[PDB]
Coordinates of C-alpha atoms in Angstrom, one line a residue:
Chain A
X217 CA 102.4 -62.4 -161.6
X218 CA 105.8 -63.7 -160.6
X219 CA 105.1 -67.0 -162.4
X220 CA 104.9 -65.1 -165.7
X221 CA 107.8 -64.2 -168.0
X222 CA 107.9 -61.4 -170.6
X223 CA 109.8 -61.5 -173.9
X224 CA 110.2 -58.9 -176.5
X225 CA 109.5 -59.7 -180.2
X226 CA 109.8 -56.4 -182.0
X227 CA 110.9 -52.8 -181.1
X228 CA 110.3 -50.1 -183.6
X229 CA 111.5 -46.5 -183.3
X230 CA 109.2 -44.6 -185.6
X231 CA 109.1 -40.8 -186.2
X232 CA 106.1 -38.9 -187.2
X233 CA 105.5 -35.1 -187.9
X234 CA 104.1 -33.2 -185.0
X235 CA 104.8 -29.6 -184.1
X236 CA 106.4 -30.5 -180.8
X237 CA 109.7 -31.5 -182.5
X238 CA 108.7 -31.0 -186.1
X239 CA 109.4 -34.7 -186.4
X240 CA 108.0 -36.4 -183.3
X241 CA 109.5 -39.6 -181.8
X242 CA 107.6 -42.9 -181.1
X243 CA 108.5 -46.3 -179.8
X244 CA 106.2 -49.3 -180.7
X245 CA 107.0 -52.5 -178.7
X246 CA 105.5 -55.9 -179.3
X247 CA 105.8 -58.2 -176.3
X248 CA 104.6 -61.7 -175.3
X249 CA 104.0 -63.1 -171.9
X250 CA 103.5 -66.7 -170.6
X251 CA 103.8 -68.9 -167.5
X252 CA 105.3 -71.8 -169.4
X253 CA 102.2 -73.8 -168.4
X254 CA 99.8 -73.2 -171.2
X255 CA 98.8 -69.6 -170.7
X256 CA 100.3 -66.9 -172.9
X257 CA 99.4 -63.6 -174.5
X258 CA 100.8 -60.8 -176.6
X259 CA 100.2 -57.1 -176.8
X260 CA 101.6 -53.9 -178.4
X261 CA 102.6 -50.9 -176.4
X262 CA 103.4 -47.5 -177.8
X263 CA 104.9 -44.5 -176.1
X264 CA 107.5 -41.7 -176.6
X265 CA 110.0 -43.4 -174.2
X266 CA 111.0 -47.0 -174.7
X267 CA 110.7 -47.8 -171.0
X268 CA 107.0 -46.7 -171.0
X269 CA 106.3 -48.8 -174.1
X270 CA 107.6 -51.8 -172.3
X271 CA 105.3 -51.2 -169.3
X272 CA 102.2 -50.5 -171.4
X273 CA 102.7 -53.7 -173.6
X274 CA 103.7 -55.9 -170.7
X275 CA 100.6 -55.1 -168.6
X276 CA 98.3 -55.1 -171.5
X277 CA 99.3 -58.6 -172.5
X278 CA 98.3 -60.0 -169.1
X279 CA 94.7 -59.1 -170.0
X280 CA 94.7 -61.1 -173.2
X281 CA 95.9 -64.5 -172.0
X282 CA 95.2 -67.4 -174.4
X283 CA 95.2 -70.9 -173.1
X284 CA 97.1 -73.3 -175.5
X285 CA 96.3 -77.0 -175.4
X286 CA 99.5 -79.2 -175.2
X287 CA 99.4 -82.9 -175.9
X288 CA 101.0 -84.5 -172.9
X289 CA 102.4 -81.1 -172.0
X290 CA 105.2 -81.0 -174.6
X291 CA 103.7 -80.6 -178.1
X292 CA 100.6 -79.6 -180.1
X293 CA 97.7 -82.1 -180.5
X294 CA 98.0 -82.2 -184.3
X295 CA 99.6 -80.6 -187.4
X296 CA 98.5 -77.0 -187.9
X297 CA 98.7 -75.1 -191.2
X298 CA 97.3 -71.6 -191.6
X299 CA 97.7 -68.3 -193.5
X300 CA 97.3 -65.1 -191.5
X301 CA 97.3 -62.3 -194.2
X302 CA 100.4 -62.9 -196.3
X303 CA 102.3 -65.0 -193.6
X304 CA 102.0 -68.8 -193.8
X305 CA 102.8 -70.9 -190.7
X306 CA 103.1 -74.7 -190.9
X307 CA 103.5 -76.5 -187.5
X308 CA 104.0 -80.2 -187.0
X309 CA 103.5 -82.4 -184.0
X310 CA 106.7 -84.2 -183.0
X311 CA 107.9 -86.8 -180.5
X312 CA 109.7 -86.1 -177.2
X313 CA 113.3 -85.1 -177.5
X314 CA 112.8 -83.5 -180.9
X315 CA 113.1 -79.9 -179.5
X316 CA 111.9 -76.7 -181.0
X317 CA 113.0 -76.4 -184.6
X318 CA 111.1 -73.2 -185.5
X319 CA 111.5 -69.5 -186.4
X320 CA 113.4 -67.8 -183.6
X321 CA 110.2 -65.8 -182.6
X322 CA 108.2 -69.1 -182.5
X323 CA 110.8 -70.6 -180.1
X324 CA 110.5 -67.7 -177.8
Chain B
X63 CA 111.5 -146.2 -170.9
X64 CA 109.2 -143.2 -170.4
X65 CA 110.7 -140.4 -172.4
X66 CA 112.0 -137.5 -170.3
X67 CA 109.9 -134.4 -171.0
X68 CA 111.6 -131.9 -173.2
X69 CA 111.6 -128.1 -173.1
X70 CA 109.7 -127.9 -176.4
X71 CA 107.2 -130.6 -175.6
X72 CA 103.7 -129.3 -176.2
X73 CA 102.8 -130.1 -172.6
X74 CA 105.8 -128.3 -171.1
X75 CA 105.3 -125.3 -173.3
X76 CA 101.7 -125.0 -172.2
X77 CA 102.6 -125.0 -168.5
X78 CA 105.6 -122.7 -168.9
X79 CA 103.5 -120.3 -171.0
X80 CA 100.8 -120.2 -168.3
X81 CA 103.1 -119.6 -165.4
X82 CA 104.9 -116.9 -167.4
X83 CA 101.8 -114.9 -167.9
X84 CA 101.0 -112.1 -170.2
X85 CA 100.9 -108.3 -169.6
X86 CA 100.5 -106.1 -172.7
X87 CA 102.0 -103.2 -170.7
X88 CA 105.2 -105.1 -169.8
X89 CA 105.5 -107.0 -173.1
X90 CA 105.2 -103.7 -175.1
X91 CA 107.0 -101.4 -172.7
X92 CA 108.4 -98.4 -174.6
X93 CA 111.8 -98.9 -176.2
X94 CA 114.3 -96.1 -175.6
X95 CA 115.1 -95.6 -179.2
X96 CA 114.7 -92.9 -181.9
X97 CA 111.1 -91.9 -181.9
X98 CA 108.6 -91.0 -184.6
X99 CA 105.3 -89.0 -184.3
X100 CA 102.5 -91.4 -183.2
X101 CA 99.5 -92.2 -185.5
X102 CA 95.9 -92.1 -184.4
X103 CA 92.8 -94.1 -185.4
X104 CA 89.2 -93.7 -184.5
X105 CA 87.9 -97.1 -183.4
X106 CA 84.6 -98.6 -182.1
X107 CA 84.5 -101.0 -179.1
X108 CA 84.5 -103.9 -181.6
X109 CA 87.5 -102.5 -183.5
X110 CA 89.3 -101.8 -180.2
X111 CA 88.8 -105.3 -179.0
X112 CA 90.1 -106.6 -182.4
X113 CA 93.2 -104.5 -182.0
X114 CA 93.8 -105.8 -178.5
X115 CA 93.4 -109.3 -179.9
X116 CA 96.1 -108.7 -182.5
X117 CA 98.3 -107.2 -179.8
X118 CA 97.9 -110.4 -177.8
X119 CA 98.8 -112.4 -180.9
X120 CA 102.0 -110.3 -181.3
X121 CA 102.8 -110.5 -177.6
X122 CA 102.7 -114.3 -177.9
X123 CA 105.4 -114.3 -180.7
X124 CA 107.3 -111.7 -178.7
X125 CA 107.3 -114.1 -175.7
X126 CA 108.6 -117.1 -177.7
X127 CA 111.1 -118.8 -175.4
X128 CA 114.7 -119.1 -176.5
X129 CA 116.0 -122.7 -176.8
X130 CA 117.3 -124.6 -173.8
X131 CA 120.1 -126.9 -175.0
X132 CA 122.8 -129.1 -173.5
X133 CA 126.4 -127.9 -173.7
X134 CA 128.0 -128.6 -177.0
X135 CA 130.9 -131.1 -177.1
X136 CA 134.4 -129.8 -178.1
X137 CA 135.4 -130.3 -181.7
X138 CA 138.7 -132.2 -181.8
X139 CA 139.0 -133.8 -185.3
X140 CA 142.2 -133.8 -187.3
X141 CA 141.6 -134.0 -191.1
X142 CA 145.3 -134.3 -192.0
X143 CA 148.9 -134.1 -190.7
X144 CA 151.1 -132.9 -193.5
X145 CA 154.5 -132.7 -191.7
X146 CA 156.3 -131.4 -194.9
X147 CA 154.9 -127.9 -194.0
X148 CA 156.3 -128.0 -190.5
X149 CA 158.3 -124.9 -189.8
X150 CA 157.3 -123.1 -193.0
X151 CA 154.6 -121.0 -191.4
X152 CA 154.5 -119.1 -188.1
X153 CA 150.8 -118.3 -187.7
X154 CA 147.7 -120.5 -188.1
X155 CA 145.6 -120.1 -191.2
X156 CA 141.8 -120.2 -190.7
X157 CA 139.8 -121.2 -193.9
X158 CA 136.1 -120.5 -193.9
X159 CA 133.6 -121.7 -196.4
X160 CA 131.3 -118.7 -197.0
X161 CA 128.9 -120.2 -199.5
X162 CA 125.7 -118.4 -198.8
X163 CA 123.1 -121.2 -198.7
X164 CA 124.8 -123.5 -196.1
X165 CA 123.5 -123.6 -192.5
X166 CA 126.1 -122.3 -190.2
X167 CA 126.4 -125.5 -188.2
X168 CA 127.1 -127.4 -191.4
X169 CA 129.9 -125.2 -192.7
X170 CA 133.5 -126.4 -192.9
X171 CA 135.9 -124.2 -191.1
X172 CA 139.4 -125.7 -190.9
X173 CA 142.7 -124.5 -189.4
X174 CA 146.1 -125.2 -190.9
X175 CA 148.5 -125.1 -188.0
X176 CA 152.2 -124.2 -188.2
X177 CA 153.0 -127.9 -187.6
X178 CA 151.1 -128.8 -190.8
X179 CA 148.0 -130.4 -189.2
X180 CA 144.8 -129.6 -190.9
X181 CA 142.1 -129.7 -188.2
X182 CA 138.5 -128.6 -187.8
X183 CA 137.9 -125.2 -186.2
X184 CA 136.9 -125.2 -182.5
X185 CA 133.6 -123.9 -181.3
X186 CA 135.1 -120.6 -180.2
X187 CA 136.8 -120.2 -183.6
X188 CA 133.6 -121.1 -185.5
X189 CA 131.5 -118.5 -183.8
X190 CA 134.1 -115.8 -184.2
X191 CA 134.6 -116.2 -187.9
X192 CA 130.9 -116.6 -188.7
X193 CA 130.4 -113.2 -187.1
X194 CA 133.1 -111.7 -189.3
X195 CA 131.5 -112.9 -192.6
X196 CA 127.8 -113.3 -191.7
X197 CA 127.5 -110.5 -189.1
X198 CA 124.4 -110.7 -186.9
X199 CA 122.8 -107.5 -185.6
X200 CA 123.4 -107.5 -181.8
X201 CA 126.5 -109.8 -181.8
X202 CA 130.1 -108.7 -181.6
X203 CA 133.2 -110.5 -183.0
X204 CA 134.9 -110.6 -179.6
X205 CA 133.1 -111.5 -176.4
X206 CA 131.9 -108.3 -174.7
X207 CA 133.1 -107.4 -171.2
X208 CA 129.7 -107.0 -169.6
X209 CA 129.6 -110.8 -169.1
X210 CA 132.4 -110.7 -166.5
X211 CA 131.3 -111.7 -163.0
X212 CA 131.9 -108.3 -161.6
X213 CA 130.0 -106.5 -164.4
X214 CA 127.1 -109.0 -164.2
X215 CA 126.8 -108.3 -160.5
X216 CA 126.4 -104.6 -161.3
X217 CA 123.5 -105.4 -163.6
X218 CA 121.9 -107.5 -161.0
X219 CA 122.0 -104.8 -158.4
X220 CA 120.1 -102.5 -160.9
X221 CA 117.5 -105.3 -161.5
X222 CA 118.5 -105.6 -165.1
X223 CA 118.2 -109.4 -165.4
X224 CA 116.1 -109.4 -168.5
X225 CA 118.7 -107.3 -170.2
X226 CA 121.6 -109.6 -169.2
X227 CA 119.7 -112.5 -170.8
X228 CA 118.7 -110.5 -173.9
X229 CA 122.4 -109.7 -174.3
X230 CA 123.4 -113.3 -173.8
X231 CA 121.0 -114.4 -176.6
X232 CA 122.3 -111.8 -179.1
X233 CA 125.9 -112.7 -178.4
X234 CA 126.3 -116.4 -177.5
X235 CA 124.9 -119.6 -179.0
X236 CA 122.3 -121.5 -176.9
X237 CA 124.6 -124.6 -176.5
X238 CA 127.8 -122.7 -175.7
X239 CA 129.3 -122.8 -172.2
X240 CA 129.2 -119.0 -172.0
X241 CA 125.5 -119.0 -172.7
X242 CA 124.7 -121.6 -170.1
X243 CA 127.1 -120.0 -167.5
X244 CA 125.5 -116.6 -167.8
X245 CA 121.9 -117.9 -167.8
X246 CA 122.5 -120.2 -164.8
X247 CA 124.1 -117.3 -163.0
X248 CA 121.2 -114.9 -163.7
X249 CA 118.6 -117.6 -162.7
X250 CA 120.6 -118.2 -159.5
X251 CA 120.6 -114.5 -158.5
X252 CA 116.9 -114.2 -159.0
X253 CA 116.4 -117.2 -156.7
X254 CA 118.6 -115.9 -153.8
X255 CA 116.9 -112.5 -153.7
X256 CA 113.4 -113.6 -154.7
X257 CA 113.2 -111.4 -157.8
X258 CA 111.0 -113.7 -159.8
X259 CA 108.7 -110.8 -160.9
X260 CA 111.5 -109.3 -163.0
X261 CA 111.2 -112.0 -165.7
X262 CA 107.4 -112.4 -165.6
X263 CA 105.6 -111.6 -168.9
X264 CA 109.0 -112.1 -170.6
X265 CA 110.4 -114.9 -172.8
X266 CA 113.0 -115.7 -170.1
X267 CA 110.5 -117.0 -167.5
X268 CA 110.1 -120.5 -169.0
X269 CA 113.8 -121.2 -169.0
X270 CA 114.1 -120.0 -165.4
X271 CA 111.3 -122.3 -164.2
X272 CA 112.8 -125.1 -166.3
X273 CA 116.2 -124.6 -164.6
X274 CA 114.7 -124.6 -161.1
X275 CA 112.6 -127.7 -161.7
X276 CA 115.5 -129.7 -163.0
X277 CA 117.7 -128.5 -160.1
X278 CA 115.0 -129.4 -157.5
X279 CA 114.7 -125.9 -156.1
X280 CA 111.1 -124.7 -156.9
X281 CA 110.5 -123.8 -153.3
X282 CA 111.1 -120.1 -153.7
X283 CA 109.1 -119.8 -156.9
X284 CA 106.1 -121.5 -155.3
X285 CA 106.2 -119.3 -152.2
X286 CA 106.4 -116.2 -154.3
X287 CA 103.6 -117.3 -156.7
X288 CA 101.4 -118.1 -153.7
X289 CA 102.1 -114.7 -152.0
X290 CA 101.1 -112.9 -155.3
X291 CA 97.8 -114.8 -155.4
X292 CA 98.9 -116.8 -158.4
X293 CA 98.0 -120.2 -157.0
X294 CA 96.8 -121.6 -160.3
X295 CA 100.3 -121.1 -161.6
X296 CA 101.8 -122.6 -158.4
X297 CA 99.9 -125.8 -159.0
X298 CA 101.0 -126.0 -162.6
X299 CA 104.6 -125.7 -161.5
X300 CA 104.1 -128.7 -159.1
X301 CA 102.6 -130.6 -162.1
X302 CA 105.8 -129.8 -164.1
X303 CA 107.8 -131.0 -161.1
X304 CA 105.8 -134.2 -161.0
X305 CA 106.3 -134.6 -164.7
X306 CA 110.1 -134.3 -165.0
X307 CA 110.5 -136.3 -161.7
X308 CA 107.9 -139.1 -162.0
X309 CA 109.7 -141.5 -159.7
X310 CA 110.1 -138.9 -157.0
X311 CA 108.4 -139.4 -153.7
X312 CA 106.2 -136.4 -154.2
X313 CA 105.0 -137.6 -157.6
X314 CA 104.2 -141.0 -156.2
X315 CA 102.4 -139.5 -153.3
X316 CA 100.1 -137.5 -155.5
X317 CA 99.1 -140.6 -157.4
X318 CA 98.3 -142.4 -154.2
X319 CA 96.0 -139.6 -153.0
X320 CA 94.9 -138.4 -156.5
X321 CA 95.6 -134.9 -155.3
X322 CA 94.5 -131.9 -157.4
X323 CA 94.6 -128.2 -157.1
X324 CA 95.8 -126.9 -153.8
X325 CA 96.3 -130.5 -152.7
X326 CA 99.3 -130.9 -155.1
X327 CA 101.1 -128.0 -153.4
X328 CA 100.5 -129.5 -149.9
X329 CA 101.8 -132.8 -151.1
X330 CA 105.0 -131.2 -152.4
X331 CA 105.6 -129.4 -149.1
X332 CA 105.6 -132.6 -147.0
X333 CA 107.5 -134.9 -149.4
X334 CA 110.2 -133.1 -151.4
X335 CA 110.1 -129.4 -150.5
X336 CA 113.5 -128.1 -149.3
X337 CA 111.5 -125.5 -147.3
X338 CA 108.2 -127.1 -146.8
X339 CA 107.4 -125.4 -143.6
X340 CA 107.3 -122.0 -145.4
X341 CA 105.2 -123.3 -148.3
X342 CA 102.5 -124.4 -146.0
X343 CA 102.6 -121.2 -144.0
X344 CA 102.3 -119.1 -147.2
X345 CA 99.7 -121.5 -148.6
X346 CA 97.8 -121.4 -145.3
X347 CA 97.9 -117.6 -145.1
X348 CA 96.6 -117.3 -148.7
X349 CA 93.7 -119.6 -147.8
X350 CA 92.9 -117.6 -144.7
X351 CA 92.9 -114.3 -146.6
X352 CA 90.7 -115.8 -149.4
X353 CA 88.3 -117.4 -146.9
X354 CA 88.2 -114.5 -144.5
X355 CA 87.7 -111.8 -147.2
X356 CA 85.6 -114.0 -149.4

């Protein structure tokens, strides 16, 4: 999968309460993958070590590849407005040379 | 005396429009300018054909040819010579009437010289000051530097003749010497290198064919029109050449033989063509290809 690139979006270091350390350690990593050619996916990987959470998330996302339709390969086909739970996203189709004027996570 | 045909004569405009042609893809080629998000409409085959018809209507207005005029005559009229004011001023005064509702070619722009003479402004002075007070989008107060011979040659190497002419129309007046000099230089470079296709489906093709007909050098345009299978256009060009030169040997030969269609081009080759041998060869090859294939 040399044509695919992986990007991190969130890294949480969360501690729970297990007898091993009294307060156990946990790393939850959200990653996204894509080939820059319409195919992309995301996954969450959890482990006790950060490096393991990266591998688990990175290889899980390759199994959940969406294909995104791009108008002429540079933009969305039409305006998109949606609410996922309490998060509203409002995308707009733009002409060439406009660039990505979006939330830093959306640019990634 | 039979009137000499004009550029705007309904007959000449018909022939010049035909040979120019139309191509909605070239006429409406995308402009490199700030862009906006496109709009979309769902249309039936009837609606789509209606939209194409309006596009062809707009492409006609877009291809409207710019005027072809003779060079203006220098303005040299002295209104007064008040010698009492000699030596009292070091620099010329230029007075411009800027009343809004006067046509620019009917405005009074006078110059009070240091000697005291009150004279009318020259053509170079008139255009400069009219840009300062009635500024026109595209035009600059001082003549740009792109119109220098070396700079124009650079544009020609890049095959940017339609731009050189669009720049000459925004800046200079149609009857000015600078306008004629640039146009006649662009038309001449197209001829030498056979780049007639650059100005097809553009408003500048009519003036180019007009210039060649008047200068009796349509040989290149005919050879190129024939090689592109535009032989109906080639005949119309020979009709325009037989219209602006009625007493020419070629025009009198076509009357004697009542030539029409491909005959007109054959008559031109023998009689008045500078390079007739090639016109027949190209014309013959076209006929051979047409007959052999179909």
